[PDB]
Amino acid sequence: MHTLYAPGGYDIMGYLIQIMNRPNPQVELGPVDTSVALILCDLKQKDTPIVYASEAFLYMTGYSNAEVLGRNCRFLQSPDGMVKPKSTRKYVDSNTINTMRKAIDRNAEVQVEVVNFKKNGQRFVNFLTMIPVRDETGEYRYSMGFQCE
Amino acid sequence: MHTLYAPGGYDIMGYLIQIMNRPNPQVELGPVDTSVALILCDLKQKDTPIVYASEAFLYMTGYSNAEVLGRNCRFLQSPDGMVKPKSTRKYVDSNTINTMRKAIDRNAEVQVEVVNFKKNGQRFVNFLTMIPVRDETGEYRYSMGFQCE
Ligand SMILES: Cc1cc2nc3c(=O)[nH]c(=O)nc-3n(C[C@H](O)[C@H](O)[C@H](O)COP(=O)(O)OP(=O)(O)OC[C@H]3O[C@@H](n4cnc5c(N)ncnc54)[C@H](O)[C@@H]3O)c2cc1C
Numbered sequence: 520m521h522t523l524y525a526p527g528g529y530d531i532m533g534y535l536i537q538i539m540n541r542p543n544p545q546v547e548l549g550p551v552d553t554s555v556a557l558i559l560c561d562l563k564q565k566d567t568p569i570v571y572a573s574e575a576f577l578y579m580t581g582y583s584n585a586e587v588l589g590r591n592c593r594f595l596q597s598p599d600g601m602v603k604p605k606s607t608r609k610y611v612d613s614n615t616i617n618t619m620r621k622a623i624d625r626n627a628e629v630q631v632e633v634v635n636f637k638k639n640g641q642r643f644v645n646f647l648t649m650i651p652v653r654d655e656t657g658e659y660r661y662s663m664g665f666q667c668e
Numbered sequence: 669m670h671t672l673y674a675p676g677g678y679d680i681m682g683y684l685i686q687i688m689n690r691p692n693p694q695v696e697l698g699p700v701d702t703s704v705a706l707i708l709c710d711l712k713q714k715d716t717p718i719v720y721a722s723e724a725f726l727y728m729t730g731y732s733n734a735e736v737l738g739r740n741c742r743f744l745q746s747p748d749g750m751v752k753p754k755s756t757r758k759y760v761d762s763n764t765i766n767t768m769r770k771a772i773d774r775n776a777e778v779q780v781e782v783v784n785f786k787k788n789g790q791r792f793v794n795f796l797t798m799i800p801v802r803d804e805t806g807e808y809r810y811s812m813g814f815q816c817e
């Protein structure tokens with residue numbers, strides 16, 4: 520991976536407002552702010568890399584910014600943080616992974632429960648919600664994910 | 669992260685998020701963003717002056733930024749934009765104006781229908797909502813108002 524990051528950073532607040540104001544929500548999220556566990560991934564870079572992670576997400580997972588930025592979030596699916604693309608997970612429901620994959624590919628909102636592992640290997644069930652986000656061009660460019668232990 | 673500050677150093681997006689995430693809302697406002705008519709007033713300044721006005725507000729009222737900034741919003745209660753504090757308004761219901769005054773003084777959310785006048789003297793009913801906003805200190809410092817014709 521050789522992910523690039525927006526100089527100036529990301530409009531996380533604007534995107535949260537965009538999400539809460541979206542016209543046809545397929546999943547209710549309730550109010551959200553920058554204090555919750557969240558991450559932003561770039562749909563237009565190789566393998567949809569994490570380009571922003573909230574402090575609550577880092578705290579929840581036990582990983583640092585340096586350890587999560589630039590990677591696809593699937594690494595949480597293994598206690599050793601080693602998950603190759605297209606691989607058959609050995610601790611995660613395959614249908615669940617396919618559900619996430621198809622939704623992200625179609626810019627469709629999705630909510631699932633997925634088995635994840637913290638840096639120290641602690642297993643937990645992550646209640647995940649992913650909502651596509653439009654940038655200044657008005658087209659879907661990012662995906663904002665919300666995590667819940 | 670990109671915090672867009674609106675022309676004075678005001679974190680308008682941050683405040684909108686704060687409002688949508690407030691724990692004990694006394695009035696429903698539903699999702700809001702910067703595309704609507706809104707203004708931010710400074711509670712720690714003499715006569716709670718407007719320090720920020722959205723373009724939607726300026727458009728709706730017909731007044732310019734130079735004409736609204738630094739003034740108390742009560743000027744909208746007169747077709748000539750001339751309203752002296754404590755004065756008995758001719759065209760506005762006093763129990764209304766008083767309701768606003770007390771709510772604002774108590775940092776209490778309020779929602780009312782008040783007669784206002786655009787710069788050209790055009791009269792209109794303003795469905796107004798005012799919500800107190802906490803700054804970085806955690807204490808109420810501003811009030812954000814949402815106008816609807
Ligand atoms: C903003 C955002 C946040 C995210 N946050 C998290 C997070 O916190 N935790 C997390 O675990 N993931 C997270 N994800 C998900 C992760 O990044 C991947 O999107 C997810 O693992 C699915 O895509 P994939 O590329 O891994 O799919 P693949 O690697 O292609 O794997 C798909 C799996 O499904 C199976 N499969 C495929 N097609 C079928 C079929 N037709 N029938 C049956 N089985 C099939 C395969 O055998 C395979 O093992 C997040 C994604 C985004 C965009």
Ligand SMILES: Cc1cc2nc3c(=O)[nH]c(=O)nc-3n(C[C@H](O)[C@H](O)[C@H](O)COP(=O)(O)OP(=O)(O)OC[C@H]3O[C@@H](n4cnc5c(N)ncnc54)[C@H](O)[C@@H]3O)c2cc1C
Pocket residue numbers: 707708709716740741742744745752753754755756757762763765766768769772782783784794796798811812813814815
């Ligand atoms: C963020 C924000 C946005 C706002 N946006 C708007 C807007 O878009 N349009 C608008 O019109 N206003 C708006 N306001 C309201 C305006 O700025 C004033 O707060 C409002 O006019 C009341 O305060 P005042 O200082 O004018 O009160 P005063 O000048 O003191 O007037 C109160 C009136 O009520 C009467 N009154 C007082 N006490 C009593 C009593 N006990 N019994 C009977 N009558 C009584 C008086 O006779 C008097 O005329 C906004 C305020 C804020 C903080």
